[PDB]
Amino acid sequence: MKYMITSKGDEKSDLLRLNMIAGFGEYDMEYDDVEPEIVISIGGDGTFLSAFHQYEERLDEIAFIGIHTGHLGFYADWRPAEADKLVKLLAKGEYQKVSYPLLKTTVKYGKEATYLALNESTVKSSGGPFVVDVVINDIHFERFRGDGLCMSTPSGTTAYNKSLGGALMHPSIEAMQLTEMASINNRVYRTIGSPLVFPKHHVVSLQPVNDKDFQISVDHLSILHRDVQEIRYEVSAKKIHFARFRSFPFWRRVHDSFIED
Amino acid sequence: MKYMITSKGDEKSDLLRLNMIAGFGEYDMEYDDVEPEIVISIGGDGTFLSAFHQYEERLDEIAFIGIHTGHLGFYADWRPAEADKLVKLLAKGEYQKVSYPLLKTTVKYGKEATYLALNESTVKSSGGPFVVDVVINDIHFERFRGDGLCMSTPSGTTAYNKSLGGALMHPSIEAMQLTEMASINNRVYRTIGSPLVFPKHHVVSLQPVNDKDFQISVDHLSILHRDVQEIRYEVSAKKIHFARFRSFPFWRRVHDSFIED
Amino acid sequence: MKYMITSKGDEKSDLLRLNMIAGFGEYDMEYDDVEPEIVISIGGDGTFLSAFHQYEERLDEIAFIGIHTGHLGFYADWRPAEADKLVKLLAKGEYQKVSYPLLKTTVKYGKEATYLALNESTVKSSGGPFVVDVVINDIHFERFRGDGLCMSTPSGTTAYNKSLGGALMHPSIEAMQLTEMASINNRVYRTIGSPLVFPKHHVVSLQPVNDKDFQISVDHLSILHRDVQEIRYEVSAKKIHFARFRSFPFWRRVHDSFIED
Amino acid sequence: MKYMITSKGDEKSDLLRLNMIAGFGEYDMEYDDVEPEIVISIGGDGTFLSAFHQYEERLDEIAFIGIHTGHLGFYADWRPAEADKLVKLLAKGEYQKVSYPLLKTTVKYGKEATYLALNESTVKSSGGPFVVDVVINDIHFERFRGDGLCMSTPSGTTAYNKSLGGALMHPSIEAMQLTEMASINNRVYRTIGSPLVFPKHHVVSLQPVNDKDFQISVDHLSILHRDVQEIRYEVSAKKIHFARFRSFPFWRRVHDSFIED
Ligand SMILES: N=C(N)NCCCN(CC#Cc1nc2c(N)ncnc2n1[C@@H]1O[C@H](CO)[C@@H](O)[C@H]1O)C[C@H]1O[C@@H](n2cnc3c(N)ncnc32)[C@H](O)[C@@H]1O
Ligand SMILES: N=C(N)NCCCN(CC#Cc1nc2c(N)ncnc2n1[C@@H]1O[C@H](CO)[C@@H](O)[C@H]1O)C[C@H]1O[C@@H](n2cnc3c(N)ncnc32)[C@H](O)[C@@H]1O
Ligand SMILES: N=C(N)NCCCN(CC#Cc1nc2c(N)ncnc2n1[C@@H]1O[C@H](CO)[C@@H](O)[C@H]1O)C[C@H]1O[C@@H](n2cnc3c(N)ncnc32)[C@H](O)[C@@H]1O
Ligand SMILES: N=C(N)NCCCN(CC#Cc1nc2c(N)ncnc2n1[C@@H]1O[C@H](CO)[C@@H](O)[C@H]1O)C[C@H]1O[C@@H](n2cnc3c(N)ncnc32)[C@H](O)[C@@H]1O
The missing domain is CATH 2.60.200.30 (Probable inorganic polyphosphate/atp-NAD kinase; domain 2)
Incomplete structure (x- = not known):
């Protein structure tokens, strides 16, 4: 579908965005940052919070995904090495949506x-x-x-x-x-x-x-x-919708961020 | 219906129980402590907790009411002077049930x-x-x-x-x-x-x-x-069911117990 | 000695200051707010904190006293009705000094x-x-x-x-x-x-x-x-010096402010 | 002087005790566990607490030292590899005593x-x-x-x-x-x-x-x-006396145990 990608704007995150855009070009994916249906945020939780607010008027039409280029985020909970597997699984669709209050x-x-x-x-x-x-x-x-x-x-x-x-x-x-x-x-x-x-x-x-x-x-x-x-x-x-491709339970996310990883 | 009344067992609570029993006798109310449908607890929260556990195997057939003869309880949230109005409103029935996890x-x-x-x-x-x-x-x-x-x-x-x-x-x-x-x-x-x-x-x-x-x-x-x-x-x-006859909101109960009353 | 009196500046505190000044005039007490040896603060802890800072360059030459015209203060720990007894005991001197870090x-x-x-x-x-x-x-x-x-x-x-x-x-x-x-x-x-x-x-x-x-x-x-x-x-x-005329222990001051009075 | 050595009683701690005893035998050091002047505790803080209580009636005649064979202790703050340097510096004496309430x-x-x-x-x-x-x-x-x-x-x-x-x-x-x-x-x-x-x-x-x-x-x-x-x-x-041979400040000990080491 229509998608867009925000970056934290350091070199790591910009270049990972450029590579994912390139990988998307090999599918029926169109980059549109006016009416995306998929918003990928690359950076940390602060980058993810910015992306939520950039698109808060189209929450119901959008699924969000966060990639953490630094430490693990609570929102940005995919690693950079998984990015190509992310491109693929997401061009097809057939992903579950998860909603938070x-x-x-x-x-x-x-x-x-x-x-x-x-x-x-x-x-x-x-x-x-x-x-x-x-x-x-x-x-x-x-x-x-x-x-x-x-x-x-x-x-x-x-x-x-x-x-x-x-x-x-x-x-x-x-x-x-x-x-x-x-x-x-x-x-x-x-x-x-x-x-x-x-x-x-x-x-x-x-x-x-x-x-x-x-x-x-x-x-x-x-x-x-x-x-x-x-x-x-x-x-x-209103609720925020995440695109999920794997089980990553909240309490595991909590264990990973605070107990150890 | 069938009802029963537990008391904390000091003089105040015993005598209030005897008076409510007497008031119930003027209605189609039968004292049965084997299969009651109404359980009234007179005392404090400890007395109310005892009454819950006495009848934990018939939670779904029972509505509970607490009368606080000491300070206000979180469970025992009717005053002793309201007891006669309690007898009346409850012989008729037509009360709402409230359920807690x-x-x-x-x-x-x-x-x-x-x-x-x-x-x-x-x-x-x-x-x-x-x-x-x-x-x-x-x-x-x-x-x-x-x-x-x-x-x-x-x-x-x-x-x-x-x-x-x-x-x-x-x-x-x-x-x-x-x-x-x-x-x-x-x-x-x-x-x-x-x-x-x-x-x-x-x-x-x-x-x-x-x-x-x-x-x-x-x-x-x-x-x-x-x-x-x-x-x-x-x-x-399973849930515990309270009989309610008036609005006494939880946060008000909290304000009354901890902020001041 | 030389003394001065700060007031919170509401009517209660101003008039208590005027009365203490009048009572001091009946002794060898001179009002001097440039080089006082006794600083009386009338008001609350905020008034007392102001008085400390007004005279922080003469801490060693000054003993402080607080009168609370509102609730009890930790610093302002004399009542308004004691003010005349305060005037007297203090014109004579022969008071103990207490020092805080x-x-x-x-x-x-x-x-x-x-x-x-x-x-x-x-x-x-x-x-x-x-x-x-x-x-x-x-x-x-x-x-x-x-x-x-x-x-x-x-x-x-x-x-x-x-x-x-x-x-x-x-x-x-x-x-x-x-x-x-x-x-x-x-x-x-x-x-x-x-x-x-x-x-x-x-x-x-x-x-x-x-x-x-x-x-x-x-x-x-x-x-x-x-x-x-x-x-x-x-x-x-450097230390701040209080003039004390009675035993009012710190832990009692704590009990009085937080447990009840 | 007279000294003694307690061990946590696992193999690591027993054998380190046997080696320190052997090293002490090469000096004017006599093993006496009735009236020691030096008490070395090998193990953790629990082992050190036991040694304090074993000798609580001779606190003023005794200096204590803790060796941690597991993680760093607050009391047992020497490492096992330092033990031979400990034997030496301590047979000579000329160490400072530090006292805790x-x-x-x-x-x-x-x-x-x-x-x-x-x-x-x-x-x-x-x-x-x-x-x-x-x-x-x-x-x-x-x-x-x-x-x-x-x-x-x-x-x-x-x-x-x-x-x-x-x-x-x-x-x-x-x-x-x-x-x-x-x-x-x-x-x-x-x-x-x-x-x-x-x-x-x-x-x-x-x-x-x-x-x-x-x-x-x-x-x-x-x-x-x-x-x-x-x-x-x-x-x-009464106070407990430690023998110190190096600067290991309390706040550093705190940083090392709780912030990271
Ligand atoms: N720290 C200051 N002065 N401002 C920082 C600005 C950017 N923040 C983005 C984020 C986040 C975030 N969301 C979560 C989440 N959902 N779960 C678990 N980690 C999470 N982060 C983590 O919070 C850490 C700090 O940021 C990073 O590690 C980030 O991984 C804004 C957000 O800070 C939060 N914030 C502000 N002040 C404090 C403070 N004093 N203590 C704790 N958090 C604070 C607040 O909740 C706001 O929304
Ligand atoms: N205190 C000891 N050692 N045992 C007391 C035995 C009897 N208790 C009956 C009750 C109650 C109660 N339920 C609530 C409620 N739902 N909401 C708000 N007040 C509530 N009470 C109030 O709790 C106070 C103390 O009891 C009374 O005022 C009563 O009004 C058993 C219950 O104590 C509780 N308890 C046990 N130990 C502690 C403790 N250290 N700190 C706090 N509570 C404690 C526990 O939660 C148990 O179930
Ligand atoms: N509250 C705001 N935003 N500013 C208030 C300005 C005036 N304050 C004068 C005082 C005092 C004071 N000293 C003590 C003492 N020595 N012992 C026990 N009571 C004490 N008071 C009491 O503190 C209460 C509030 O003031 C009054 O009741 C007064 O009786 C300045 C002082 O506030 C303190 N302050 C600031 N912010 C907070 C806060 N969030 N929580 C708690 N205290 C706060 C701070 O410690 C400062 O110095
Ligand atoms: N945990 C139970 N139920 N009993 C444990 C028995 C043995 N303890 C020896 C010790 C110690 C110690 N002194 C210090 C010190 N001076 N500084 C910093 N670490 C310190 N340890 C560390 O405390 C940890 C646990 O032990 C170890 O890591 C040890 O390194 C007895 C001592 O436990 C303490 N204790 C008991 N219960 C608790 C509890 N709930 N929470 C915290 N401490 C507890 C208590 O203060 C007692 O004296």
């Missing part, structure tokens, strides 16, 4: 902006002290004082969420997980402490208490938002 | 024993050093050295799991969560560290490395098991 | 700047990814990747250090304590994880790996530093 | 027993729920509910203390550090959470609330104590 972020002003995250969305203050009221399904749950909050997809749980103490969640679970960044807890100030895992259709809303300027990140993108009234998180109805 | 534990010797947990199951060594190989869906994930492991239901996530650093999980999510107890981590010894959340149909198996004697707990019950070859955890196909 | 921070460019902290000093990146080599007494200890690092005095251990997982340290111990902010840890990236407690005369140095711009905080002051070659932490030879 | 544990009944720990002392319940009142210098600090408590020396901070979230403390600091094992924390139950570091002459006392039977461990030794009224921890006035 995404996180929808809505930011409301005094106007709305929506974003999709594959790893996580985080909120930190814009200089002052971060204080937000945390409301779950319209129920006021807690007043959070500290550095910030992190809302993670299942496949993001091994990224920032992990470094914050979060649980690792199998990506077949349709959920999102909220972790704390350095909460204050004393006599007058109380947060839950524990990470929180929310199912589909639960809405977690962050509302400002005084300062209304926040630094909001979505995966690698970090935007200073002013005059913010609300930040709403829920599990997205 | 359970954890199946299988212990294999060199023979099998199965247990159901509403809170969690834990494994600790029987005196020596605890070392177990942790295998996920037949894939060797890690060699765990430390005090022990805890496998939690969703509604157990606010119990022992919470004190071990685990995430709180909404009980609509069909999953189980594994936390570490004091793992050793140095140059030669590596565990994941993070809690792990597993979906339905994933099997987590613990296999001994040297010592084969373990202390296995299931909720409040703690059994020394000898000549153990394997401990297998999976989300149960 | 401070943290020296040195920032080197390509030039040096020194700062003293009563709570802590922290380093975070200026937008990009924070990567620093951590060198202890000229020995390369670790390469830290993550959000940042926090170096705490003993009396700062109940502040930011606490929210980062650090240990609480009795202020009679001449030490400093380093905690991590969200470290990355996988196959290729390793930090110690644990907080580290250093004695006097140990030098902890942070050296940039790529980006050389950092946000460095000292207590409440936060400065963007450019062209930074090194950040050096050691226990200061 | 120890922890005194006192257990009172209704009678007293004292123990010295080089790593830590821990208290866990004997089957039931562990509840103890924690009293610091006769001030009631907290009521601890959970699995247990761990009191660590500075050189023990890299052992059990580390796995419990404690800080690593340089052994020149005369202190002890208390960590929690799985504390319960909700609306009605509050502990500090953070590790606590205590200086010399502070006394931390654990007093039973209901159950008075506890499992008390001291380093590798674990004793069930009945009819316990109190457990008192303080930094010992």
Whole structure:
């Protein structure tokens, strides 16, 4: 079908892209980076996150594949030496698609902006002290004082969420997980402490208490938002689709990245 | 229908049981503690856990209700002053049933024993050093050295799991969560560290490395098991059913128990 | 002697300052905010931290006292109703002095700047990814990747250090304590994880790996530093002196702020 | 002088002991395991802990040395190939002594027993729920509910203390550090959470609330104590002395054991 290939842009990744393009030319494969059906990302997880966001408006028409030219990625989980076998198996098609949940972020002003995250969305203050009221399904749950909050997809749980103490969640679970960044807890100030895992259709809303300027990140993108009234998180109805050609289970991917490989 | 009432056995709880029994006698309600359809537990979460285990072989025919005569429970979430309104609404029926996941534990010797947990199951060594190989869906994930492991239901996530650093999980999510107890981590010894959340149909198996004697707990019950070859955890196909008469959301129950009430 | 009084600047604190000034006028007490020997801070810990920094160049000639007009402070540990008894006991003198350690921070460019902290000093990146080599007494200890690092005095251990997982340290111990902010840890990236407690005369140095711009905080002051070659932490030879009129032990102060009061 | 050598008792360690004994016979060295002045431990940290306890009543007359025949130890920090150079440098003497703090544990009944720990002392319940009142210098600090408590020396901070979230403390600091094992924390139950570091002459006392039977461990030794009224921890006035022949700094030892070697 139509395909395209992003590269991290170092010499290794560019030349592997040029070779795969050449191998694709020997099949009924057309390079189209406007409406691809296959997006191959060559580089690391940062390169893969860029490719997701380049094509986030055509998620349902696209299957993604990551090739790691450095260390193993959680998303970029094919090796460079497998690239020619990848070209072949994929020109034919007849591959399985695997789908992972995404996180929808809505930011409301005094106007709305929506974003999709594959790893996580985080909120930190814009200089002052971060204080937000945390409301779950319209129920006021807690007043959070500290550095910030992190809302993670299942496949993001091994990224920032992990470094914050979060649980690792199998990506077949349709959920999102909220972790704390350095909460204050004393006599007058109380947060839950524990990470929180929310199912589909639960809405977690962050509302400002005084300062209304926040630094909001979505995966690698970090935007200073002013005059913010609300930040709403829920599990997205949209999913990212991977093309799979072999069994590479999530927990094995986890063992390989963190225990040893 | 047929009903029964367990009491914590202090004066407050016994007398509230006697009064509810009296109120039930004014309806088509028959006290039967052999085949009840309604099990009311009066006391705290420990009393409720006992009632679950007393009737674990008739989970599908029974709806449970907890009355907390001390502080609020996660399971025992009606107040004593509501008891007469409880008698009434429940003689009529026309109540909704709510179902929470359970954890199946299988212990294999060199023979099998199965247990159901509403809170969690834990494994600790029987005196020596605890070392177990942790295998996920037949894939060797890690060699765990430390005090022990805890496998939690969703509604157990606010119990022992919470004190071990685990995430709180909404009980609509069909999953189980594994936390570490004091793992050793140095140059030669590596565990994941993070809690792990597993979906339905994933099997987590613990296999001994040297010592084969373990202390296995299931909720409040703690059994020394000898000549153990394997401990297998999976989300149960069975569920516990609660009778609900009002909206009392899980996250509100969490806010009330941990943030303030 | 010579004294001065800072106020948080709300009505409560201003008027308590005016009343204490009036009470001092009935003794051989002269208000001098250029070379005081007694500095009274009225407000909270933030007000007390400001007063420390206003007079950091005359630490050895000054005894400090904090009055908390809001909740109890760790530094501002007298109540407003005790103020008149404070005026009296202090005009006479004959009070004990108590001394707490401070943290020296040195920032080197390509030039040096020194700062003293009563709570802590922290380093975070200026937008990009924070990567620093951590060198202890000229020995390369670790390469830290993550959000940042926090170096705490003993009396700062109940502040930011606490929210980062650090240990609480009795202020009679001449030490400093380093905690991590969200470290990355996988196959290729390793930090110690644990907080580290250093004695006097140990030098902890942070050296940039790529980006050389950092946000460095000292207590409440936060400065963007450019062209930074090194950040050096050691226990200061200078100490802050408190005037004490009663026994109020540190662990009791800790119990009162965090367990209940 | 008089010396002796303990072995882990596998073939490697026994034969290295026999060779060092032979090398010592070529000097004015007499093997005496009743009143040695030099105690060499061959094996790992467990072997070294045994040697400390074998000779705990002659700590001040003895210098200790550890040889690691397996991985590097924190105590057993010479390699087997250095053994002949060790024999030589040590027959001459003219070595520096290095001293580390120890922890005194006192257990009172209704009678007293004292123990010295080089790593830590821990208290866990004997089957039931562990509840103890924690009293610091006769001030009631907290009521601890959970699995247990761990009191660590500075050189023990890299052992059990580390796995419990404690800080690593340089052994020149005369202190002890208390960590929690799985504390319960909700609306009605509050502990500090953070590790606590205590200086010399502070006394931390654990007093039973209901159950008075506890499992008390001291380093590798674990004793069930009945009819316990109190457990008192303080930094010992006694110290353990190491013989040093080279610079091997603590933080380097830490880097080598946990970061990589
Ligand atoms: N929160 C933001 N963004 N900035 C707040 C600015 C003013 N702060 C003054 C203070 C203090 C203080 N010293 C102690 C002490 N010695 N012991 C125990 N309480 C203590 N306070 C208490 O800390 C609470 C918050 O302030 C109040 O209750 C105050 O009672 C500056 C100080 O904040 C600290 N700080 C900054 N960010 C965080 C964070 N994420 N988590 C925890 N503390 C944080 C840091 O340690 C700095 O010095
Ligand atoms: N693991 C069980 N159930 N019992 C093991 C019995 C023998 N132990 C001897 C030792 C040691 C030691 N001292 C240090 C030190 N000073 N610094 C850094 N390494 C150190 N070791 C290392 O600890 C590892 C395990 O042993 C080895 O690698 C050894 O290299 C007794 C000691 O175990 C410690 N221990 C007990 N239970 C746990 C646990 N759950 N987590 C962490 N440590 C634990 C405790 O602190 C005790 O004293
Ligand atoms: N580190 C800074 N300041 N910015 C880095 C920018 C580029 N990042 C791309 C990625 C990724 C990624 N996804 C996963 C995944 N799904 N699973 C497991 N590894 C994963 N990586 C790995 O994360 C490491 C660092 O990047 C690499 O090894 C990469 O292999 C953006 C992403 O960083 C994450 N991030 C930001 N800050 C921190 C932090 N303090 N601690 C931990 N992660 C952090 C965040 O989750 C964001 O989306
Ligand atoms: N504490 C000891 N040694 N044994 C106590 C025996 C009786 N327990 C009944 C219960 C419960 C319970 N379920 C929940 C829930 N679903 N959600 C939130 N609260 C919950 N409770 C609360 O847990 C507190 C303690 O009990 C009470 O307040 C009760 O309200 C058995 C249960 O203890 C739990 N447990 C055991 N040891 C620890 C520990 N170290 N830390 C934390 N919990 C622990 C474990 O999860 C087991 O099932």
